[PDB]
Each structure stands twice: as structure tokens, then as C-alpha cells.
Amino acid sequence: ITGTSTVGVGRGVLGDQKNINTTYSTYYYLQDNTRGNGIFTYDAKYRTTLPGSLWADADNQFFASYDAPAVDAHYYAGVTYDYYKNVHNRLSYDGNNAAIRSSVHYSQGYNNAFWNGSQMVYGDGDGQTFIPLSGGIDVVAHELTHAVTDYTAGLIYQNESGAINEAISDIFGTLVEFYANKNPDWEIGEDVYTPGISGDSLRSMSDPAKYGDPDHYSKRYTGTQDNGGVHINSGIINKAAYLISQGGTHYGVSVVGIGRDKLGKIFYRALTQYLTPTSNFSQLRAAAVQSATDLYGSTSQEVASVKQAFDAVGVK
Ligand SMILES: [Ca+2]
Ligand SMILES: [Ca+2]
Ligand SMILES: [Ca+2]
Ligand SMILES: [Ca+2]
Ligand SMILES: [Zn+2]
Questions:
Q1: CATH code 1.10.357.10 for 155-315
Q2: Which of 81, 101, 111, 181 is most buried, most CB within 10 Å of its CB?
Q3: 160 assigned ligand-binding residue
Q4: Per the residue annotation, which of 105, 143, 250, 302 is the catalytic one?
Q5: 231 is a catalytic site residue
Q6: Could you confirm whether 88 is annotated as catalytic?
């Protein structure tokens, strides 16, 4: 909408106060004009029609329980935009400052979030498996990263390419969580998963097997559920990425860690210069090795560590 840029205040899903960029024209809308061609947050009103209505508020204060998922979807989309711009010199998901749209209050009791080809979509959860999913910065960044993937490598959402797609979203979801630097970890979704159980998460990158996901290629799933295991076999790549950053010895193979920033540089370059829609895990290894070679040199520690990490997870 046409209007003037304003600054509202509210509370997110976890009860924390934050400022949000809004637009005033009769109402205050969740429209942040400070980033690219805008970040826009919509109310799906417990239905499944998308996007729903651009979020309108009479007073620019967003402290109601109903407001909290919208506050966080809007704010964390801004953090994710900032990460891609400041860290990777990428302007929005398309590289040309496309408007970023999210809808909250999608459906009833909806235990998921997704990118629908055009926008992000967040359920409220059923209150037991999840609370509203936009409360997780790793979740928001996971979803926006699907848009980045779709505009770049275009990894098909099935089998190995789809597991790479998923891992890219978990990797950058985690790197955005570290960028914001509030309780960062190598777990996925811990802030919104199972409010009655402390210390758990939906997936672990540091130890995928904690939640039954493979941490070695010899343990990959090859059935048909979950699009051929895209959220399962992502554990093999998540583990490799964790090892590249943090190091460790895994199935007897030692990896020298190189840190998160270099992990992000290597995987961003692989995603945007080397991966294709049909890349498999072996092709990802080759893309990561080439990316590290471009950035750091063929004789570098960074190249050696990429090779170590893929060896550790059984990917040649
Ligand atoms: Ca209000
Ligand atoms: Ca965390
Ligand atoms: Ca996390
Ligand atoms: Ca929990
Ligand atoms: Zn995903």
C-alpha cells in the first residue's frame, strides 16, 4: 500500500518485545519499506486461501496474542533479508529485491510451514507439537531459503537433490540464527517445537541420529515417503556442514573445523554457481570442493576440510 513508513512495537510468540517496520495509511500495516521492495505480512485468518489480508492494525501496537505470529514472521523475515544482503550481497530471494510475503494463522492446528512457490506460509501449531512456527528464526530463514534455492540452483524436491534442498534450508536457517545471536545452536525448530518438553528439537545438525535421521550415506533412506526422504537424508548433508564448521571425528574420520562464516561462503557459492536442479550428493561434494577452491585456493585448509567432512559422511 502507499503510505508513510512507521515503527510499531509488539511482542513475539516467545513473549519478547521488538520494534517492527510498518506503513501508515488509515491503518498501520505490516509492510516494511526499509528492505528492498518491501516485506509484507498477511493474516490467513485460520483459513487456507492465500495470501489473505495484508495485516492491518489500528494503533501500531502489536501486543495481542493473535498478533504474536505476525510480529515474528515480519521481524525474522527482516533479519533473514539482512543476512543475505550483508553477508552474501544478495538482494532478497531473487537477487533483485523481490517483495517478501508471508501469511500467518494458516489453517487450524497446522503443524508446519512452507514456501508455496510465491510466499512463506506459517501454521499456528496445535499447541502440543508446535506453537506458532514463525516464532523460530531458524524456521523463518529455512522457509525463505527455499525461495533462494528455487531462484538459484533449483534443486528438485525429491530424492538426493531434494535432501540437498532441505539441508541448504537447515544450514542457512542455522546461520541466520547465529547471525541474530539469540540462543544460537545447530538444532532446528527448538524454539517452537513441543512446548511441554525442554531440550528437544525437530532435527539436529550436530547429531542427526538423535531424531532418527542418518548421519552417513550408508544409512540413507531410499523409500518413497517424504518425497524420497528429503527431511531424512538431509541429515547426511547437515552433518557434513556441521563438521566443516565445527570439526570433529565421525566414524573415525577427523575433520578440522573452519568456522561458520567460511561454511556459509562455501555453501552459498555452491548453491549459486555450481548446483543444478538434479545435483546429487556426490555432485554437491564436487561443488563444495570447487567453491572452497575458488575462495581459498586448492592447497587451502578449507578445501581439505570440505573433503574430510564429506569423507566422514560417506559421500565421494
Ligand atoms: Ca494494535
Ligand atoms: Ca536456538
Ligand atoms: Ca536452532
Ligand atoms: Ca520442546
Ligand atoms: Zn524445508
A1: no
A2: 81
A3: no
A4: 143
A5: yes
A6: no
User: How far does the centroid of ligand 4 lie from the alpha carbon of residue 148, in Å?
Assistant: 28
- Nearest ligand by distance to the CA of 183: 2
Domain ranges of the chain: 6-154, 155-315
**How were these coordinates obtained?**
X-ray
Q: Computed over its alpha carbons, how large is the radius of gyration of the chain?
A: 19
